[PDB]
Structures are given as C-alpha cells and as structure tokens.
Subunit: 159 residues, 8 copies
C-alpha cells in the first residue's frame, strides 16, 4: 500500500505526459505517489523530497520536466535511489533541450533517461517495474505477462 | 562471484568508453561479466545473450554502442531485466546519432539511457549499483560511502 | 504472383507513411507483401522474417520505423537481401531520430536509406523497382514509362 | 571484366572515403569503374555519364560527395538504374550537410543513402553486392561467405 | 518587357513560397518569368534553361526548392549569371535540409542564399533588384523609394 | 574589498573558461569571490551559497558549467539576485547541451545566459559590470573607458 | 514615473511574445516604455535609441527579435546599459536561429539571453527587476513577494 | 583602380577565411578594398561605411563574420547595394551560429549568403564577379574563361 515509486513532475503542464507513467504503474498494481515538484520554483521542496525518499520506503523515482529540465538530475543529487528522467516535449525545441538537460549528467550522479514525451513516461514506469521485479516475484510475473501481451498483440499486417 | 550485471558492447572500439563502467562495478565490488556482442554482426548471439540473462542470474544489463546504436534496444527487446544504454561517441556526429538511436525507444521497451561517452558508462555502472543496492544492504552502504566521498572530495575553490 | 518485395513496418502508426510504398509497387505491378513487424515488440518475429526472406523468394525488403528506428538495420542483420529503410517522421524530433537510427549503420551491414516520411516510402518502392528491373525486362519497361511520365507531367509554370 | 558498378565522386578529396567502396567491390570480385565527376564543375559530364550508364552495362551506381552533395541526386535524375549515395564527411558540419543533401530526395527520384564517411562507402559497395547477388549465384555465394565470416570474426570479449 | 529575372521552382508546391518573389518583382516593375523546373524530375529542362538564360537576356536567376534542394546549385552549374537560392520550408526538417543543400556550395559555383521560406523568396527578389539597380537608374530610384517606405512605415510602438 | 560578485563553477575543469570572467572583474576593479560549487556533487553547498548570497553582500552571481549544466539555474532558484550563466564548452556536443541546459529556464526563474566558452565568461563579467555601474559612478566611468578603448582599438584593415 | 526599463522588439509580430515582459514589469510597478525598433528596417532609430538610453534615465533594456535576431546585440553595441535579449520563436527554426543570433555574442559586448519565447520575455522582465532591486528597497520587497508567491503557489500534486 | 567591391570582416581572425575572397577578386582583376569593421565594437564605423558605400562607388559588399554574425545584416540595413555574407567558421558551433545569424534575414533586408568558411569566401567573390560581369563585357569574358577552365581542369579519375 505504501508507495515504492515516486512520480514527480516540474508542473501541472507536464501531467499530460507523466499521466502515462501513472497509468502504467497502476496497471501493474505498483503502489506509488504522484506529485508536482519544481526544481526552480520549489527547490527546498525538491531537496526535502529527494533526501527523505529512501527513508519513506521509495525504491525508484520517476522525474519529468521540460526545457532546462533539471528536476531529474537535482533529485538524483540528493538521493541514492535510482532516478529515471522523462524529457517532456517543449514547445519550441520539441524536448531536445529537455533531453540534453537530463541525459548529459556528468559522471557521479546518474539519471536513467527515457524517450521524449509520452513514450518515455510510459517506459519510465516499465523500467521502474523491471527494477522492482528483481525482488518482487508476484510483480515479476505480472510484468512478464504485460510484456508477453504486448508482443502477442502486435498485428501481423496493417489495417 | 556469479555475475549480477552484464556489460556488453558492439565492438572493441567501444571498450575505451565502457571500461569506465567495468572499473566502477569492480570498485563497488559488484560481480559482473564484460562481453562484445554485435547487434548487426552477431544478432543471434545477442538474442541468446539477452533471452537467457535472467535465468543466468543477471539483474541488470549495461549495453554500449555508437552510431546507429541498436545493441541496447534489441537487448531490451529480448530480456525482461532493466537495460541501461551508453551512447558511445561517434566520429562525425559526436554521439548524437548514438544518443537518439538509444534513448528514443517507443513505448513498451525501455532503455535507461546515460550521457554520451565516459561519463555515461560510469553513470550506467552507478545506476546499476543504485538498483542492486535496493536489495543488498552491504552494497547500499558501499554506494552511500562512495556518494558521500564524492561530495566531500569537491574542492571549495579552483587552482587559478 | 509470389511476393518479390516485402514491406515491413514497426507499427500500424507507420501505415500512413508506408502505404505510399505499397501503392507504388501495386502501380508497377510488383507482387509484394505488407506486414507489421516490430524490432522491439516482436524481435523473434523479425528474426524469423529476415532469416527466411530469401528462401521465400523475396528479392528486396523495404522496412519503415520511427524514433529509435532499428527495424531496417536488424532486418539487414539477418538477411543477405538488400534492405531499404524508410525513416518515419516522429512526433517530437520529426524523423531526425528515425533517420540517424537507420542511415548511420556501421560498415558490414547496409541499409539503403530514403527520405523521411511519405517521399521516402514512395522512393523505397521505386528503388526496389529499379533493382528488380535489372533482371525483369517487362518491369524495366514499366519503370521507364513511369519515370518518363513523371518527367513529362511536370508543368512548365505554376498555377 | 566489363564494369557492372560505377563509383563516382565529386573530387579527389572524396577518394579517401570512396576507396573503401572500391576495395570492397574488388574483394567480392565485382567488376567496376571509378571516376571523378563533379555535379557543379562538370554538369554535362555527369549528365552524359548517368544517361549512358545502363546502355554501357552498369547495373548500380555508387556516388559520393560532401557539403551540398548533389552528385548522387543528379545522377539518379538521369539514370533509371539504382543509385546509392555516400555522404562524405565535411569539415565544418561533419557530413550533416552531406547527409541531408543526399537522403532528402523528394518522391520520384530515389537515392539509397548510406552512413557518413568510410562506413557508408563500404556499405554502399556491400549494398551494391547484395543487389547484384540477386541474379548472380556465384556472387551470392561469395557475399554469403563474406557475411558469415564477418559474423564468425566477432570476438566474445574485449581486450581490457 | 523581356524578362531580366527568371524565377524557377522545383514544384507547384513551392509556389506558396515563391509567389512572394514574383509579387515583389512585379511591385518594382521588373520584367520577369516564373517557371517550374525540377532538378530531379526535369534535369534536361533545367540544363537547357540554365545554359540559355544569358543568351535570352536574363540577368539574375532566383531558384527555390525544398528537401534535397539541388535546383539553385545545378542551375548555377550551367550559367555564369548570378543565381539566388530560396530554401523552401520542408515538412519534417523545416527547411534545414533545404538550407544546407543550397548554401553549402563548394568553392567555384556560388548560390547567394536567402532565408528559409517566404522571407527568403521576398529577399531574393529584393536582392535581384539591388543587382539590377546597379545599371538601371529608374529601377535604382524605385528600389530606394521601396527601402525608404519600409523604414518609414515601421510603427514606433506595438498595438 | 568585500565581494559584490560571486563566480561559481561546477568543477576545476571549468576554470580554464571562467578565469576570463575573474580576470575581467579584477581589470575593472570589481571585488569578487571565485569558488567551485557542484550542483550535483554538493547540492547543499549550492543551496546555502545561493540562499545566503544577498545577505553576504553579493549583488550578482556568475555561474559556469558544462554538459547538463544545472548550476546557474539551481543557483537562481535559491537567490533573488540576478544570476548570469556561462555555458562551458562540452567535449561531444561542443557546449550545445551546456547552452540549452542553461538558457531554457521556464518562466519565473531567470538566468541571463552568455556565449559558449571564453567569450561568454568574459561577457558575463562585463554584463555584471554594467549592472553594478548603474549605482556606482566610479565603476561606470571605468566601464565607459573600457568600452571606448575597445572601440578605438579595432584596426581599420587586416594583416594580409 | 519616468521609464527605467526599455522594452524594444523588432516588429509588431514579436508583440505576442514581448507582451509578457510588459505585463510582468507593470505587475511589479516598474515604470517602462514599450517600443518597436527594427535593427534592419530602422537601423538609425536603433542607434539613436541605444545611444541616448542612459541619458534618458533607462537602467536596463529588454530587446526581443526572431530569425537573424540582431536587435539585442546591436543595441548593446551602442549602450553601456545591461541589455537582455529575448529570442522570439521563428516559424521554421523555432527560435534556434533567434537564440544563436543573440547568445553567441563575442567577448566585449554582452547580451544576457533568456529562453526562447514567452518564458524568456517574462524572465527578461524578472531579470531586469532583480537588477533594479539592487538599488530600490521597495521594489526589492515587491520582487521578494513575487518570488515567494510563485514558490508557495505551486500545487503539491497534479489535477 | 577605384574599388567596386568592398570586403569587410569583423576581426583579424576572420582574415584567414576572407583572404580567399580577396585573392579571387584580384585574380579576376576586380578593384576592391579590404577592411575590418566590427558591428559590435565599431557600430558607427559600420553605419558610415555601409551608408556611404554607393556614393563612394562600391557596387557590391562582401561581409564576413563568425558566431553571432551581425556584420552582413547590419551592413545591408544601411546600404541599398547588394550585400553578400560569408559565415566564418566558429570554434564551438562550427559556423552554424554564423550561418543562421547571417542567412535568416527577415523580409525587406537581403543578404546573399554563401557557404561556411573558405568556400563561402571564394564563392562570395565569384558571386560578386557574376554581378559585375552583367555590365562589364571585359570582366564577363574573364569570368567565362575562369569558369570554363575550372570545368576543363576536373580530372576524370582519382589518384588511388
Ligand atoms: N525544469 C523545471 C523546473 N521546474 C519546472 N520545470 C519545467 O518547466 C516547464 C514549464 O512549466 P510551466 O508550464 O508551469 O511554466 C515544465 O515542463 C517543467 O518540467
Ligand atoms: N522502432 C520500432 C520498433 N518497433 C516499433 N518501432 C517504431 O515505434 C514507433 C511508434 O510505434 P507505436 O505507435 O505502435 O507506439 C513506430 O513509428 C515504429 O516504427
Ligand atoms: N529538389 C527538387 C528538385 N525538384 C523538385 N524539388 C523539390 O521537391 C519538393 C517537393 O516536391 P513535390 O511536392 O512536387 O513532391 C519541392 O519543394 C521542390 O523544391
Ligand atoms: N531581426 C530583426 C530586425 N528587425 C526585425 N527583426 C525580426 O524580424 C522578425 C519578423 O518580422 P516581420 O514579421 O515584421 O517580417 C521579427 O521576429 C523581428 O524580431
């Protein structure tokens, strides 16, 4: 019941994208929390969230932001937990700024980065699941079923 | 000493970059294997490697490649384990082709991507360590110690 | 009657683009098959398709995918047949990711890459035709007519 | 020994890259010619070359150029044969201008484009070989042998 | 009455852009012709057009094309006349491919390149005018008036 | 001699670039401090530095970093003072990652960004000087003199 | 009452973007002027504006332009005052041309550059405010309140 | 020998590139002047130069600069003469910033832009020559001869 994954996003505007991570976790029955945490507008809220994440029982953090997307990196700066970053597609640069701001982390503080947009949000949740599955047999089985269904469902020819 | 992390790379030329992931895993005392698997030259070798990773005891796979880097993505397609991708810097496009070829995975098959080059390889190892640390108290302490040392080792001013 | 060209695409979403390759082949009366094969979601389906392509009588394979577009490259990894890649325009990066993921193949396993989008799909079919025309006199004549009509039809001034 | 593949390049400076296509065709015993044809400096030479390629017995044309690389595209405009383009790495833009100038052909006139640089030149030759192999059993066996050797030659682990 | 400027474009689809060059020339009363000439679909039409341009009395050629935009460069390859290139905005790459295909001409055969899109088409006509004005006093005066009106008309504050 | 400008950088490797900002401030006689603060390795050090800048007497902060450059942005998040960012050139992406990571701040938290590399560091110092000059007549005269000298020092023709 | 900040933009078309800088300054009660000044269409208007800015009592200049956005740089060339540049999102290149034309100023003449688009316009006004706050206690207090409200207002979770 | 073409550049560092335009004009016997005019460091010098170009007898202006290259555009803003811009290759962005800063002129003030670097400088001179040739029969013949020689000088095959 207690969340094992924390989904944080820099703004309400990122929800359209991050909701895909939320849906996936719920689908796999992975207890999680979904919050808005701005690296620039609420820096202390972020520091506190990242510092206490482990203590609170969180295993993985999924962070999404657009533009100069510093949320994932700064969260990883304060936590030893694995942090997965989702580049939100920005208006002008289409997430290229989001992508480079997240993936190009110097050695020492990692952020496992996923694709720009909804696909990345969905994959961040799937990656968090594959991580949790390493020590949760029941979830490991549900994830196997999910992957098997994805594979089996692909049509053989276009409509 | 059975391996729990597998480091794979498209070619010997990728080793200059991937050796950083290897060194870091060893530093944190994380048993691992290091191999060369070409997605394009040895596709069946990759299929078998990725497909049997979980049963062989691996928990995380770190895959590095450059240019049209398909190794990480195709590895993830065959394993249910988390796959971390390292974009190896390419000659002409400086790893931008490597980066986009790895990170832009469509929904359903994730690849946790790290920075282009050495930093990405080192961070892939650290990311793998933070994953393993979730269920290994001894490793968790070693990683915490490693992180705390990195922080304490930063100088307060530059050598002018 | 048996297909000599195989058109494969990573998803139904690629059909809007790949249908242009299908239309062109039908126009030139080139027997072909059109399938959905995902490099990531159906990896074994792809391995089997590429391995047996030659045995089945296929001469050329046209593969289209977007984003981290690995379909063309991985298909070429398993077949000795010429593989032509069509970069599908992605939402965020407009096919730049699709393009680099396909064209930047290291030495040893080639993929003849065409333009991003519909133009590339149409040209992949025309390129496959020009290849088949080398050993099919009737098709060679139909292709010559097609090229001649394209040239002759261009207006002399804009409307 | 009549040529069945024609390798053309915009200038002597392109040879460093295109020699890889030449070497590979010779390796697979594919008769070919190698020339310099400038789309901008010798437009009529290009027109005549491309226009008469088929009647001269050529089956495939490999064209390489850098910067605003129009050689492949203009060659394709004058021949009905398949034209393969090799983006030669440029000084400032590292072949990105070469790549986009070649691959972005509008509908109606195709250019099968390969990677920027040496890899693209080698792959253009291999692509040409896979095309010729469709109607040449002897070459088909040589290519199959070449591909099988590439696969078998990949090492299982890196030299650390 | 005889055209002194030739506006050529690779396709009817480029007209939306090149019409701005046409309008500007008409505005300055510069006799010109507007044609469709495809470098790839009508290569011989282009060779002939460029070869005979000077003989026909043309002074400047404005050429527009998108994607692998080879029209300007190949036209300049056959004529000694100044050739101005207009990168047409492409669907996927927004004219970046058009721009690089035109501006990156190696030494020896120049193409004076203008901005991507309508602005470039308008400026190609203005540049052609500034060239013609060097030997046409009446046009030089009309161009001076045009520039003076542009400058004088800029509002002092936004509405 | 109390500092009114603070120059901070992510690492010693940034000094090669940031020394230009330091040199220019000293040239214009602007008291300042120069430190290394890592946004990722010493996040709490950064928080404290940025948070206390105003009370410590600083008027402007110049922050430089490369790659995923978060130092300037996070500094601005904790201080109400104007923060100027210098994109340090990165190995693979040549500072493009540095540039976009710094300049693309969302509405609400500004970072006045300068050019990639040495020019940006020098201009950050000059921008800081033009800010301080608004309420420091002596500095205003020194800056005016500096600008007038730059203008007068430009040669009329090149050495051929 | 006399303006202490000058907002200039290359065209009426930039107003949709620059109005955000205007709104912010008015919100913080910072006396300012808002004008249209084209670096290319009204070069002398710009030279005069920049030359006399300081004499007129202006403290900071916010300049916005798109495409080959030279307005900020050329304004800084004529004034000792701090000049802040706002890259306006261009149609084709989405402000990447605007951004590079503004931020890449060689050493000697700076332009503090903000993000592409509305965010940058809003931040240019906030940056100008943080500069003015250094010598205006009342404004410093209003800016502190503004920042505090921004931070306090961020929701804890998405809707 | 009165100059009919004016070559201007932002700094001495631009000369390495712009010397190619100078050499070509001299080769074609086109009287010209070569100066350094900084749009940012000597704005009034630029205004006066561009404003008086036509009355001084100039017919074409070739302007070269790198980075945020405003020299060509601002020159065009003050003269009614055709202005040709040469993007000088920049350190970090390899002339991409130079290119976009020059070519992307909005409607109303044109700058005929050439390739990044040496090729662009040479082509700017050739473009200027083709403009002057329209009303100078002697120069027209010299240019025709120059073009015909370039064509005839292209080798038929590479040195392998
Ligand atoms: N980087 C960052 C830090 N805090 C918020 N953001 C990003 O700011 C962007 C725009 O936010 P908004 O729409 O609230 O202005 C969002 O995508 C969010 O990720
Ligand atoms: N690379 C790849 C492998 N398998 C599918 N894709 C690509 O995934 C993209 C999005 O697929 P979908 O819309 O089904 O999520 C498609 O363009 C398809 O080419
Ligand atoms: N490069 C070129 C040569 N011939 C035509 N084009 C370009 O092809 C693009 C698309 O043409 P269409 O819409 O007819 O398929 C047009 O922008 C035109 O400039
Ligand atoms: N760079 C520049 C100089 N003068 C105007 N501009 C820019 O020209 C663009 C388009 O202007 P318009 O819509 O009036 O043609 C505007 O974004 C404006 O910043």
């Amino acid at each position: 019941s207690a969340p094992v994954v924390g989904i944080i996003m820099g703004s309400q505007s990122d929800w359209e994208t991050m909701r895909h991570a939320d849906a996936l976790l719920t689908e796999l029955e992975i207890p999680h929390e979904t919050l808005i945490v701005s690296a620039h507008r609420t820096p202390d809220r972020l520091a506190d969230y990242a510092r206490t994440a482990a203590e609170r029982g969180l295993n993985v953090i999924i962070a999404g932001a657009g533009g100069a997307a510093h949320l994932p990196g700064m969260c990883a700066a304060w936590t030893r937990l694995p942090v997965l970053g989702v580049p939100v597609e920005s208006r002008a640069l289409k997430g290229m700024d989001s992508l480079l701001s997240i993936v190009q982390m110097p050695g020492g503080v990692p952020v496992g980065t996923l694709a720009i947009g909804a696909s990345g949000a969905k994959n961040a949740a799937l990656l968090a699941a594959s991580i949790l599955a390493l020590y949760n047999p029941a979830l490991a089985a549900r994830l196997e079923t999910w992957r098997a269904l994805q594979t089996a469902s692909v049509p053989n020819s276009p409509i």
